[PDB]
Coordinates of C-alpha atoms and ligand atoms in Angstrom, one line a residue:
Chain A
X1 CA -20.6 -31.0 -116.8
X2 CA -22.3 -30.4 -113.5
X3 CA -19.4 -27.7 -112.6
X4 CA -18.7 -28.0 -108.8
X5 CA -16.3 -26.1 -106.4
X6 CA -14.5 -26.8 -103.4
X7 CA -13.0 -24.1 -101.3
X8 CA -10.5 -25.9 -98.9
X9 CA -8.0 -28.6 -98.9
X10 CA -7.9 -30.2 -96.6
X11 CA -7.2 -34.2 -95.7
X12 CA -11.4 -34.3 -96.1
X13 CA -11.7 -30.7 -99.0
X14 CA -9.0 -33.1 -100.7
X15 CA -11.3 -35.9 -100.2
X16 CA -13.9 -34.5 -101.1
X17 CA -12.5 -32.9 -104.4
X18 CA -11.2 -35.7 -105.6
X19 CA -14.5 -37.5 -105.4
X20 CA -16.7 -34.9 -107.7
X21 CA -13.1 -35.4 -110.2
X22 CA -13.8 -39.0 -110.3
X23 CA -17.4 -38.8 -110.7
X24 CA -16.3 -36.3 -113.6
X25 CA -17.5 -32.9 -112.9
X26 CA -15.7 -29.9 -114.0
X27 CA -14.0 -29.3 -110.3
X28 CA -12.7 -25.9 -109.7
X29 CA -10.9 -25.7 -106.4
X30 CA -10.3 -23.2 -104.2
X31 CA -7.4 -23.2 -101.3
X32 CA -5.8 -20.4 -99.1
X33 CA -1.8 -22.0 -99.2
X34 CA -1.4 -22.8 -102.9
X35 CA 0.5 -25.3 -102.0
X36 CA -2.2 -28.1 -101.8
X37 CA -4.3 -27.8 -105.4
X38 CA -1.2 -29.4 -106.8
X39 CA -2.1 -33.5 -106.7
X40 CA -5.3 -32.5 -107.4
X41 CA -5.0 -30.6 -110.5
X42 CA -3.0 -33.1 -111.6
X43 CA -6.1 -35.1 -111.4
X44 CA -8.5 -33.1 -113.8
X45 CA -9.0 -29.8 -111.5
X46 CA -9.0 -26.2 -112.7
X47 CA -7.0 -24.3 -110.0
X48 CA -9.3 -20.8 -109.3
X49 CA -6.6 -17.7 -109.0
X50 CA -9.1 -16.0 -106.4
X51 CA -11.9 -16.3 -105.0
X52 CA -13.8 -14.7 -106.9
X53 CA -12.9 -16.7 -110.0
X54 CA -13.6 -20.2 -107.7
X55 CA -17.3 -18.8 -106.9
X56 CA -18.3 -17.3 -110.5
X57 CA -16.9 -21.2 -112.0
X58 CA -20.4 -23.0 -110.4
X59 CA -23.5 -22.5 -108.8
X60 CA -22.1 -25.5 -106.5
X61 CA -19.5 -24.4 -103.9
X62 CA -18.3 -26.9 -102.2
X63 CA -16.7 -25.6 -98.6
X64 CA -14.4 -27.5 -96.6
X65 CA -12.4 -25.3 -94.1
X66 CA -11.3 -25.9 -90.7
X67 CA -13.8 -23.4 -89.2
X68 CA -15.2 -18.6 -89.3
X69 CA -12.9 -19.0 -91.8
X70 CA -16.2 -19.5 -94.4
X71 CA -16.3 -15.4 -93.8
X72 CA -12.8 -14.9 -94.7
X73 CA -12.2 -17.2 -97.2
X74 CA -15.6 -16.7 -99.2
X75 CA -16.4 -13.3 -98.0
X76 CA -14.4 -10.9 -100.8
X77 CA -16.7 -12.7 -103.3
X78 CA -19.1 -10.0 -102.5
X79 CA -21.6 -10.3 -105.8
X80 CA -20.5 -13.6 -107.3
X81 CA -21.9 -14.7 -104.6
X82 CA -25.5 -13.4 -105.1
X83 CA -27.6 -16.7 -107.2
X84 CA -25.5 -19.9 -106.0
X85 CA -25.1 -21.8 -103.4
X86 CA -23.4 -23.1 -100.7
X87 CA -23.0 -26.6 -99.4
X88 CA -21.0 -26.2 -95.4
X89 CA -19.6 -29.7 -94.5
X90 CA -17.3 -28.4 -92.0
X91 CA -19.6 -26.4 -88.8
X92 CA -18.8 -26.4 -85.2
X93 CA -21.6 -25.8 -83.9
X94 CA -25.3 -25.4 -84.3
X95 CA -25.2 -21.4 -83.5
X96 CA -23.0 -21.6 -85.8
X97 CA -24.3 -23.0 -88.6
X98 CA -27.6 -20.7 -88.3
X99 CA -24.7 -17.7 -88.3
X100 CA -23.6 -19.0 -91.8
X101 CA -27.1 -19.8 -92.9
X102 CA -27.1 -15.6 -92.0
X103 CA -24.7 -14.8 -92.9
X104 CA -24.8 -16.7 -96.7
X105 CA -29.2 -15.4 -97.3
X106 CA -27.4 -12.0 -96.6
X107 CA -25.5 -12.3 -100.5
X108 CA -28.7 -13.9 -101.8
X109 CA -27.1 -17.7 -101.9
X110 CA -28.4 -20.5 -100.9
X111 CA -27.5 -22.4 -97.6
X112 CA -26.9 -26.2 -96.7
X113 CA -25.4 -27.5 -94.2
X114 CA -23.5 -31.4 -94.1
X115 CA -22.2 -33.5 -91.6
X116 CA -19.6 -36.2 -92.6
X117 CA -20.5 -39.4 -91.2
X118 CA -17.5 -41.4 -92.2
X119 CA -13.6 -40.6 -92.7
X120 CA -11.7 -38.7 -96.1
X121 CA -10.6 -42.6 -97.3
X122 CA -14.9 -43.7 -97.7
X123 CA -15.6 -40.5 -99.5
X124 CA -17.0 -41.2 -102.8
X125 CA -17.2 -44.8 -101.5
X126 CA -19.9 -47.7 -100.6
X127 CA -21.4 -46.7 -97.5
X128 CA -20.4 -42.7 -97.3
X129 CA -23.5 -41.2 -95.8
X130 CA -23.6 -37.6 -95.4
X131 CA -26.9 -35.4 -93.2
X132 CA -27.9 -32.2 -94.7
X133 CA -30.2 -29.9 -93.6
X134 CA -31.6 -26.1 -95.1
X135 CA -33.4 -25.4 -97.8
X136 CA -35.3 -28.7 -99.1
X137 CA -35.6 -27.0 -102.8
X138 CA -32.0 -26.5 -102.1
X139 CA -31.1 -29.9 -101.7
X140 CA -33.6 -31.3 -104.2
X141 CA -31.8 -29.4 -106.5
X142 CA -28.6 -30.4 -105.4
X143 CA -29.4 -34.2 -104.7
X144 CA -28.0 -35.7 -107.4
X145 CA -24.1 -34.4 -107.4
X146 CA -24.3 -34.5 -103.6
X147 CA -25.0 -38.2 -103.7
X148 CA -21.7 -38.5 -105.7
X149 CA -20.2 -38.3 -102.5
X150 CA -22.3 -39.9 -99.5
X151 CA -25.6 -41.4 -100.2
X152 CA -27.0 -38.0 -99.0
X153 CA -29.6 -38.0 -95.8
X154 CA -32.2 -34.8 -95.3
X155 CA -32.4 -34.4 -91.5
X156 CA -35.3 -31.4 -92.2
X157 CA -34.8 -27.0 -93.1
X158 CA -33.4 -25.5 -90.1
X159 CA -29.2 -24.9 -90.8
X160 CA -28.6 -26.4 -87.7
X161 CA -29.6 -29.8 -87.7
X162 CA -27.1 -31.7 -89.1
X163 CA -24.5 -30.4 -86.9
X164 CA -26.5 -31.4 -84.1
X165 CA -27.4 -35.1 -85.0
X166 CA -23.3 -35.1 -85.7
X167 CA -22.7 -34.0 -82.6
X168 CA -25.3 -36.1 -80.6
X169 CA -24.4 -39.2 -82.5
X170 CA -20.5 -38.9 -82.7
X171 CA -21.0 -38.0 -78.4
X172 CA -22.5 -41.7 -78.6
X173 CA -20.2 -43.0 -80.6
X174 CA -17.3 -41.9 -78.5
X175 CA -18.7 -43.5 -75.3
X176 CA -19.1 -46.9 -77.1
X177 CA -16.0 -47.0 -78.0
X178 CA -14.5 -46.4 -75.0
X179 CA -17.0 -49.1 -73.4
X180 CA -15.6 -51.3 -76.0
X181 CA -12.2 -51.1 -74.6
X182 CA -12.7 -51.3 -70.7
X183 CA -14.6 -54.8 -72.5
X184 CA -11.5 -55.5 -74.5
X185 CA -9.1 -54.8 -71.7
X186 CA -11.3 -57.6 -69.1
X187 CA -11.2 -60.6 -71.8
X188 CA -7.6 -58.9 -72.5
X189 CA -6.5 -59.6 -69.5
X190 CA -7.8 -63.5 -69.7
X191 CA -5.7 -63.5 -72.9
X192 CA -8.4 -64.2 -74.6
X193 CA -7.3 -62.9 -78.5
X194 CA -9.2 -59.5 -79.1
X195 CA -10.6 -60.5 -82.8
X196 CA -12.5 -63.0 -82.1
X197 CA -13.7 -60.7 -78.7
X198 CA -14.4 -57.8 -81.5
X199 CA -16.6 -60.3 -83.3
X200 CA -18.5 -60.8 -81.3
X201 CA -18.8 -58.1 -79.9
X202 CA -19.9 -56.0 -83.3
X203 CA -21.4 -58.3 -85.7
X204 CA -23.4 -60.1 -83.1
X205 CA -24.2 -58.4 -79.0
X206 CA -24.0 -54.7 -79.7
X207 CA -27.3 -54.1 -82.8
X208 CA -28.7 -58.3 -80.5
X209 CA -28.3 -56.5 -77.5
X210 CA -27.5 -52.8 -77.5
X211 CA -29.7 -51.6 -80.4
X212 CA -32.9 -53.9 -78.7
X213 CA -32.4 -52.9 -75.2
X214 CA -32.1 -48.8 -76.3
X215 CA -35.1 -49.2 -78.6
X216 CA -36.9 -51.7 -75.3
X217 CA -36.2 -48.3 -73.2
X218 CA -37.2 -46.0 -75.5
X219 CA -40.6 -44.9 -74.7
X220 CA -41.6 -44.4 -77.7
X221 CA -41.2 -47.0 -79.9
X222 CA -42.7 -50.3 -79.0
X223 CA -37.6 -58.3 -78.6
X224 CA -39.7 -58.1 -74.5
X225 CA -37.7 -56.8 -73.7
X226 CA -36.1 -54.9 -70.6
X227 CA -32.6 -53.4 -69.1
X228 CA -34.6 -54.0 -66.0
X229 CA -35.2 -52.1 -63.2
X230 CA -32.2 -49.7 -61.7
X231 CA -31.7 -51.6 -59.0
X232 CA -30.3 -54.7 -61.0
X233 CA -28.4 -53.0 -63.1
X234 CA -26.8 -51.4 -59.9
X235 CA -26.0 -54.9 -58.8
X236 CA -24.5 -55.9 -62.1
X237 CA -23.1 -52.8 -62.8
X238 CA -21.0 -54.5 -59.2
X239 CA -20.5 -57.0 -60.5
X240 CA -18.1 -56.3 -63.6
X241 CA -16.5 -54.2 -61.2
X242 CA -15.2 -57.2 -58.7
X243 CA -15.2 -58.8 -62.0
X244 CA -12.9 -55.5 -63.2
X245 CA -10.4 -55.6 -59.5
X246 CA -9.6 -59.2 -59.3
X247 CA -8.9 -59.1 -63.3
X248 CA -6.1 -56.4 -62.4
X249 CA -8.4 -54.2 -64.9
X250 CA -8.5 -49.9 -64.4
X251 CA -12.4 -49.9 -62.9
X252 CA -13.0 -45.8 -64.0
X253 CA -15.8 -46.6 -66.9
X254 CA -17.9 -49.5 -64.5
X255 CA -16.7 -47.3 -61.5
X256 CA -18.6 -44.2 -62.9
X257 CA -21.8 -45.8 -64.9
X258 CA -23.0 -47.2 -61.4
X259 CA -22.1 -43.8 -60.3
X260 CA -24.7 -42.7 -62.5
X261 CA -26.8 -45.4 -61.9
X262 CA -27.3 -44.6 -57.9
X263 CA -28.1 -41.1 -58.4
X264 CA -30.7 -42.4 -60.9
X265 CA -32.2 -44.3 -58.1
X266 CA -32.0 -42.2 -55.4
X267 CA -33.5 -39.3 -58.2
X268 CA -36.2 -41.9 -58.9
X269 CA -36.7 -45.5 -57.7
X270 CA -34.9 -48.3 -57.3
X271 CA -37.5 -49.3 -59.6
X272 CA -37.5 -46.7 -62.5
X273 CA -36.3 -47.7 -65.8
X274 CA -33.8 -47.0 -66.9
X275 CA -34.3 -44.5 -69.9
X276 CA -34.9 -42.3 -66.7
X277 CA -31.4 -41.4 -66.3
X278 CA -31.5 -38.6 -69.2
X279 CA -33.9 -36.8 -66.9
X280 CA -30.2 -36.4 -64.2
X281 CA -28.9 -34.4 -67.6
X282 CA -31.9 -31.9 -68.9
Chain B
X1 CA -30.1 -89.1 -76.9
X2 CA -32.9 -88.5 -74.9
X3 CA -35.5 -85.9 -75.9
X4 CA -37.1 -86.2 -72.5
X5 CA -35.1 -85.5 -70.5
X6 CA -35.2 -85.0 -67.2
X7 CA -34.2 -81.8 -65.7
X8 CA -33.9 -79.9 -62.0
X9 CA -34.0 -76.2 -62.7
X10 CA -32.7 -74.9 -59.1
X11 CA -34.2 -71.6 -58.8
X12 CA -37.8 -69.8 -59.4
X13 CA -36.8 -65.7 -59.7
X14 CA -37.9 -64.6 -62.6
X15 CA -35.7 -66.2 -64.8
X16 CA -35.7 -69.5 -63.5
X17 CA -39.5 -69.7 -64.3
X18 CA -38.9 -69.1 -68.1
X19 CA -36.2 -71.8 -68.0
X20 CA -38.2 -74.6 -66.6
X21 CA -40.8 -73.6 -68.7
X22 CA -38.9 -73.1 -71.8
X23 CA -37.3 -76.9 -70.6
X24 CA -40.9 -78.3 -70.0
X25 CA -42.4 -76.6 -73.5
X26 CA -39.7 -79.1 -75.2
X27 CA -41.2 -82.0 -73.5
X28 CA -37.9 -83.0 -70.7
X29 CA -39.7 -84.2 -67.7
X30 CA -39.3 -81.1 -64.9
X31 CA -38.8 -80.8 -60.9
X32 CA -38.6 -77.4 -59.6
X33 CA -37.0 -76.3 -56.0
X34 CA -37.2 -72.8 -54.9
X35 CA -36.3 -71.5 -51.6
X36 CA -39.4 -69.4 -50.8
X37 CA -42.5 -71.5 -51.6
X38 CA -44.8 -70.0 -53.5
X39 CA -43.2 -69.9 -56.7
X40 CA -43.6 -72.8 -58.1
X41 CA -47.6 -73.4 -58.8
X42 CA -48.0 -72.1 -62.6
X43 CA -44.9 -74.4 -63.5
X44 CA -46.3 -77.5 -61.7
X45 CA -49.4 -76.1 -63.6
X46 CA -47.2 -76.4 -66.8
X47 CA -46.2 -79.8 -66.4
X48 CA -43.4 -79.6 -63.3
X49 CA -43.2 -81.3 -60.3
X50 CA -42.2 -79.6 -57.0
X51 CA -39.2 -81.3 -55.1
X52 CA -40.6 -80.7 -51.3
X53 CA -36.0 -80.1 -50.7
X54 CA -32.8 -79.8 -52.1
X55 CA -32.4 -83.8 -51.9
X56 CA -34.8 -84.7 -53.8
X57 CA -34.5 -81.6 -56.6
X58 CA -30.9 -83.4 -57.0
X59 CA -31.8 -86.3 -57.1
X60 CA -34.9 -86.5 -60.0
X61 CA -32.5 -85.0 -63.0
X62 CA -28.7 -86.0 -64.2
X63 CA -29.1 -82.2 -65.3
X64 CA -29.0 -79.9 -62.9
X65 CA -30.0 -75.9 -63.8
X66 CA -29.4 -73.6 -61.1
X67 CA -30.4 -69.6 -61.5
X68 CA -30.0 -68.4 -58.1
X69 CA -29.5 -65.1 -57.1
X70 CA -26.5 -65.5 -55.1
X71 CA -25.1 -71.8 -54.8
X72 CA -22.9 -73.6 -51.7
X73 CA -25.6 -73.0 -49.4
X74 CA -29.0 -73.9 -51.5
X75 CA -26.9 -77.4 -53.0
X76 CA -25.0 -77.6 -49.8
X77 CA -27.1 -80.4 -47.6
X78 CA -27.5 -82.4 -51.5
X79 CA -23.6 -82.8 -50.9
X80 CA -23.8 -86.5 -51.6
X81 CA -26.2 -87.2 -53.8
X82 CA -25.2 -84.6 -55.9
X83 CA -21.9 -87.7 -57.3
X84 CA -21.9 -87.9 -60.9
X85 CA -24.2 -85.2 -62.0
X86 CA -24.2 -82.6 -63.7
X87 CA -24.7 -77.8 -62.4
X88 CA -24.7 -75.8 -64.9
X89 CA -24.6 -72.8 -62.9
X90 CA -26.3 -69.8 -64.4
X91 CA -25.8 -67.4 -62.4
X92 CA -22.4 -66.4 -61.2
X93 CA -21.2 -62.7 -60.6
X94 CA -17.4 -63.3 -60.8
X95 CA -14.9 -65.6 -62.6
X96 CA -13.5 -66.0 -59.3
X97 CA -16.8 -67.3 -57.8
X98 CA -17.0 -69.4 -61.2
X99 CA -14.3 -70.7 -60.2
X100 CA -14.9 -71.8 -56.7
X101 CA -18.4 -73.1 -57.9
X102 CA -16.4 -75.1 -60.2
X103 CA -13.6 -76.6 -57.0
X104 CA -17.3 -77.4 -55.4
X105 CA -18.4 -79.2 -58.2
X106 CA -16.3 -80.7 -58.2
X107 CA -15.2 -82.0 -55.0
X108 CA -18.5 -83.8 -54.9
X109 CA -18.1 -85.8 -57.8
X110 CA -20.8 -83.3 -60.4
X111 CA -19.6 -82.4 -63.8
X112 CA -19.7 -78.1 -64.4
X113 CA -20.8 -75.5 -66.5
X114 CA -21.2 -71.8 -65.9
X115 CA -23.3 -69.9 -68.0
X116 CA -24.3 -66.4 -69.2
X117 CA -27.7 -65.8 -70.0
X118 CA -27.8 -62.8 -72.7
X119 CA -31.8 -61.7 -71.9
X120 CA -34.0 -61.3 -70.3
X121 CA -36.2 -63.9 -68.6
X122 CA -39.5 -63.1 -72.1
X123 CA -37.2 -63.5 -74.6
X124 CA -35.3 -67.4 -72.9
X125 CA -36.6 -70.0 -75.6
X126 CA -37.7 -68.2 -78.0
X127 CA -35.4 -66.8 -81.4
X128 CA -32.4 -64.8 -80.9
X129 CA -31.5 -66.2 -77.5
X130 CA -28.6 -66.6 -76.9
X131 CA -26.3 -68.4 -73.6
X132 CA -22.4 -68.0 -73.6
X133 CA -21.0 -71.2 -71.5
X134 CA -17.7 -72.3 -70.6
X135 CA -16.4 -75.8 -69.4
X136 CA -15.8 -79.5 -70.5
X137 CA -16.4 -80.2 -73.7
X138 CA -17.2 -82.9 -72.8
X139 CA -19.9 -81.6 -70.4
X140 CA -20.5 -79.1 -73.1
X141 CA -21.1 -81.7 -75.7
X142 CA -23.8 -83.8 -74.4
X143 CA -26.0 -81.2 -73.1
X144 CA -25.8 -79.5 -76.3
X145 CA -28.7 -80.2 -77.7
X146 CA -30.9 -79.8 -74.3
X147 CA -29.5 -76.5 -73.3
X148 CA -30.2 -75.2 -77.3
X149 CA -34.1 -75.2 -76.0
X150 CA -32.8 -73.0 -73.8
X151 CA -30.7 -70.1 -76.5
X152 CA -28.4 -70.2 -79.4
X153 CA -25.6 -71.9 -76.8
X154 CA -22.1 -70.7 -77.2
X155 CA -19.3 -72.2 -76.0
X156 CA -16.1 -70.1 -75.3
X157 CA -13.9 -72.4 -74.2
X158 CA -13.3 -74.9 -70.3
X159 CA -12.1 -72.9 -68.2
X160 CA -15.0 -71.8 -65.6
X161 CA -14.6 -68.3 -65.8
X162 CA -14.9 -67.7 -69.1
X163 CA -18.6 -66.7 -69.1
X164 CA -19.2 -64.7 -67.2
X165 CA -15.6 -62.7 -68.2
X166 CA -17.5 -62.5 -71.9
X167 CA -20.8 -61.6 -70.4
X168 CA -19.3 -58.5 -67.9
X169 CA -17.1 -57.5 -70.8
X170 CA -19.7 -56.7 -72.9
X171 CA -22.4 -55.3 -70.2
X172 CA -19.7 -53.2 -69.4
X173 CA -19.7 -52.3 -73.6
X174 CA -23.4 -52.4 -73.2
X175 CA -23.9 -49.5 -69.6
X176 CA -21.7 -47.7 -72.1
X177 CA -23.0 -47.4 -75.4
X178 CA -26.2 -46.4 -73.5
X179 CA -25.1 -43.8 -72.0
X180 CA -24.1 -42.1 -73.9
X181 CA -27.2 -43.2 -76.9
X182 CA -29.3 -40.7 -73.6
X183 CA -27.2 -38.2 -74.0
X184 CA -27.7 -38.0 -77.9
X185 CA -31.8 -38.1 -76.8
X186 CA -31.1 -35.2 -74.5
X187 CA -29.0 -33.6 -76.7
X188 CA -31.6 -34.1 -80.2
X189 CA -34.3 -33.5 -77.5
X190 CA -33.1 -30.5 -76.0
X191 CA -34.0 -29.1 -80.4
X192 CA -37.6 -30.9 -79.7
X193 CA -36.4 -33.7 -82.2
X194 CA -38.8 -36.7 -82.4
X195 CA -37.1 -39.3 -80.2
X196 CA -38.7 -42.2 -81.8
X197 CA -37.2 -40.9 -85.4
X198 CA -33.7 -40.2 -83.9
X199 CA -34.0 -43.7 -81.8
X200 CA -34.6 -45.5 -85.3
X201 CA -31.3 -43.4 -86.6
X202 CA -29.3 -43.9 -84.1
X203 CA -29.3 -48.0 -83.6
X204 CA -30.7 -49.4 -87.6
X205 CA -28.0 -47.2 -89.3
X206 CA -25.7 -45.1 -86.7
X207 CA -24.5 -48.0 -84.6
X208 CA -23.4 -50.7 -86.8
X209 CA -22.9 -48.4 -89.8
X210 CA -20.6 -45.7 -88.0
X211 CA -20.0 -47.4 -84.1
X212 CA -19.1 -50.9 -85.4
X213 CA -16.9 -50.0 -88.0
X214 CA -14.5 -48.8 -86.6
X215 CA -14.7 -50.0 -83.2
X216 CA -13.4 -52.8 -85.5
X217 CA -11.4 -50.2 -88.2
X218 CA -9.4 -49.1 -84.7
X219 CA -8.7 -52.5 -83.6
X220 CA -5.3 -53.6 -84.4
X221 CA -6.0 -57.9 -84.8
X222 CA -8.7 -56.9 -87.8
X223 CA -8.7 -56.0 -91.3
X224 CA -10.2 -44.6 -88.8
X225 CA -11.2 -42.6 -86.2
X226 CA -7.6 -40.3 -86.5
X227 CA -5.3 -39.3 -83.7
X228 CA -6.5 -38.6 -80.6
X229 CA -5.7 -34.5 -80.8
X230 CA -8.2 -34.3 -83.6
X231 CA -11.1 -36.5 -80.9
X232 CA -10.0 -34.1 -78.7
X233 CA -10.8 -30.8 -81.2
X234 CA -14.2 -33.3 -82.5
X235 CA -15.0 -33.3 -78.0
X236 CA -14.9 -29.9 -77.1
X237 CA -17.6 -29.4 -80.3
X238 CA -19.7 -31.8 -78.6
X239 CA -19.0 -30.2 -75.2
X240 CA -19.8 -26.7 -77.1
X241 CA -23.5 -27.8 -78.7
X242 CA -24.1 -29.1 -75.1
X243 CA -23.8 -26.3 -73.2
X244 CA -25.5 -23.8 -76.2
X245 CA -28.5 -26.1 -76.0
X246 CA -28.8 -26.4 -72.2
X247 CA -28.3 -30.1 -71.9
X248 CA -25.9 -31.1 -68.9
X249 CA -22.2 -31.4 -70.4
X250 CA -21.1 -34.6 -67.6
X251 CA -20.7 -37.8 -70.9
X252 CA -18.4 -35.7 -73.1
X253 CA -16.9 -33.8 -70.4
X254 CA -15.9 -37.3 -68.8
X255 CA -15.2 -38.6 -72.8
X256 CA -12.7 -35.7 -73.6
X257 CA -10.9 -35.9 -69.7
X258 CA -10.0 -39.0 -70.3
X259 CA -8.9 -38.6 -74.1
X260 CA -6.2 -36.0 -72.0
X261 CA -4.6 -38.1 -70.0
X262 CA -4.2 -40.2 -72.7
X263 CA -2.4 -37.8 -74.6
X264 CA -0.5 -36.6 -71.1
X265 CA 0.4 -39.9 -70.9
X266 CA 2.4 -39.8 -74.8
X267 CA -0.8 -41.1 -76.1
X268 CA -1.3 -38.2 -78.1
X269 CA -1.0 -38.9 -81.7
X270 CA -1.2 -42.2 -81.6
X271 CA -4.8 -44.0 -81.9
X272 CA -7.8 -43.3 -80.5
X273 CA -7.0 -47.4 -79.4
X274 CA -4.2 -47.0 -77.0
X275 CA -6.8 -44.9 -74.9
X276 CA -6.7 -48.8 -74.0
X277 CA -3.3 -48.4 -72.6
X278 CA -4.7 -46.8 -69.5
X279 CA -6.3 -49.5 -67.8
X280 CA -3.9 -52.7 -68.3
Ligands
NAP1 N1 -33.8 -60.9 -65.5 C1 -33.1 -61.0 -66.2 O1 -32.9 -59.5 -67.0 C2 -31.5 -61.1 -66.5 C3 -31.0 -61.7 -67.3 C4 -30.2 -62.3 -68.0 C5 -28.7 -62.7 -66.6 N2 -29.6 -62.9 -65.0 C6 -29.9 -63.3 -64.6 O2 -30.1 -64.5 -63.7 C7 -30.3 -64.3 -62.4 C8 -31.7 -65.3 -61.5 O3 -32.5 -64.0 -61.9 P1 -33.9 -64.2 -61.5 O4 -34.6 -64.1 -62.3 O5 -33.9 -65.9 -61.5 O6 -33.4 -63.0 -59.7 P2 -32.4 -63.0 -58.7 O7 -33.5 -62.0 -57.3 O8 -31.5 -62.7 -59.8 O9 -32.7 -64.5 -58.2 C9 -34.0 -64.1 -57.5 C10 -33.4 -66.5 -57.4 O10 -32.9 -66.9 -56.4 C11 -32.8 -67.5 -55.7 N3 -31.9 -67.0 -54.0 C12 -32.0 -66.3 -53.1 N4 -31.0 -66.1 -52.0 C13 -30.9 -67.4 -52.7 C14 -30.7 -67.7 -50.9 N5 -29.9 -67.6 -50.2 N6 -30.4 -69.4 -51.5 C15 -31.7 -70.3 -52.0 N7 -31.7 -69.2 -53.3 C16 -31.9 -68.2 -52.9 C17 -34.2 -67.3 -54.7 O11 -35.1 -67.3 -53.9 P3 -36.0 -67.2 -53.0 O12 -37.3 -66.6 -54.0 O13 -36.3 -68.2 -51.8 O14 -35.3 -65.9 -52.1 C18 -35.0 -66.2 -56.3 O15 -35.3 -68.2 -57.1 C19 -29.6 -63.4 -62.4 O16 -29.0 -63.0 -60.4 C20 -29.7 -62.2 -63.4 O17 -27.9 -62.6 -62.6 C21 -31.0 -62.1 -65.0
CA2 CA1 -39.8 -49.3 -75.8
CA3 CA1 -8.5 -52.3 -87.6

């Protein structure tokens, strides 16, 4: 029971449909190219002839398209959307989430915007987390079904929040990964084995030092417990740059990180907190 | 093995003081020394003996814990008193400097460990404190129990430069991660999202469950982030969202530029981890 329709059968859409099939939903799939449905049909999905069919098969509609492609893909369903719910899992920016909400509401359709926080292969498995924003009543109604994809975290009722959080978190992820790669290059230049360093960095340093220092620096969280003044950190960075030069490793990462600090000291004090770096960007 | 081992601490800045106080708390006979007078008094209050000069300080203990700002200049006058003692140097800047200190120590007949303090002064001698060490394994095993009073002691290997190398590495990751976090916080903050709650989500969940897992997934020798090209698209959305929110795009622009360089060097369609080959 609990019928669900998935629109969009790229790598992620297919993972979504397959996970719902694995939990035993009646899953109807739809895709622009008809080739991509066959493996899901093999797994017990019904392929919809057309979008009206797809949409009418289920009260819940899970959308995972390539971007725009929402309006063009589901538009022809017209009045069949009325009284249904769209869970849009692809949005690029908050403005696009907001446009999709307007579109949905214009058709009498409930709307949730979601951000998938794991790769396709993790969808449906323990550890999977999806962020949602939109109507709380819609969320509470479909919570149990959404839980088959990933632990569902409701951020608030405004449409654009999930994509905002997602873009924010991903921005941190890229910077952290790049810093990690500089670190691994640095120890690798002396022939340190990467696996063991990586475990030290990730199982210990990341949560015990990086996480605690972020919470220490955050002015509204109260580890005793600080990154120290900007000046002290500029000196630390100079040693990291020195170390990179003597090891033959590119100094771009730590040079940039240092330059940023120099701008903050200039705007503020050698004594100002690390967190005040943020005021350069807002 | 002497539970009350005499120890000398040279350098009484915020960190050196924390070191000395932690050893005093664990019942060592601690002699302290600093260049500038005036920093020793609180430690003397706690039971430390103040050394007049560095020969005095050095000749009081077989174990010498050094925590200077910079070593050669401070301990130079004690050249001959150094013979048969052990230096634990907790403040080298680079691996080369650690190696120079080793050569200098060994020349004078003194054992040498280099250490990196991984917590702030207020955490020294408290739960969670960790110190990284490198140098002679016999020196390490001899003083391990004493060093444990400062922080959980992790021996990385016998080569002098390793502790500073690991420390600089780890700290390089920390700065990048913090800067990314600050961009994230600015971004949610621009919509009026409260910072505390976002910070706890980012740190208590995202950091270990996502950032740490993906690093381990990308690391070729541990058993992902998708191709480089997929990630450039994701970064373009982050830039777009940053522009719509009125938040400076520097951080995600620089991250994106790095990926563009990687795809240009022929690492497009390769794994994210291959970005590393741009730097070595
Ligand atoms: N505090 C932290 O957050 C932290 C965390 C981890 C690691 N560490 C490391 O621990 C080291 C020691 O730090 P600290 O907190 O004690 O402050 P610091 O400013 O790095 O060092 C101050 C100490 O170094 C001495 N010093 C400076 N120049 C000297 C010279 N030419 N000859 C002899 N002594 C000299 C100072 O003596 P005077 O007082 O006479 O000038 C003072 O005792 C740091 O450099 C840092 O790399 C610090
Ligand atoms: Ca705080
Ligand atoms: Ca791996």
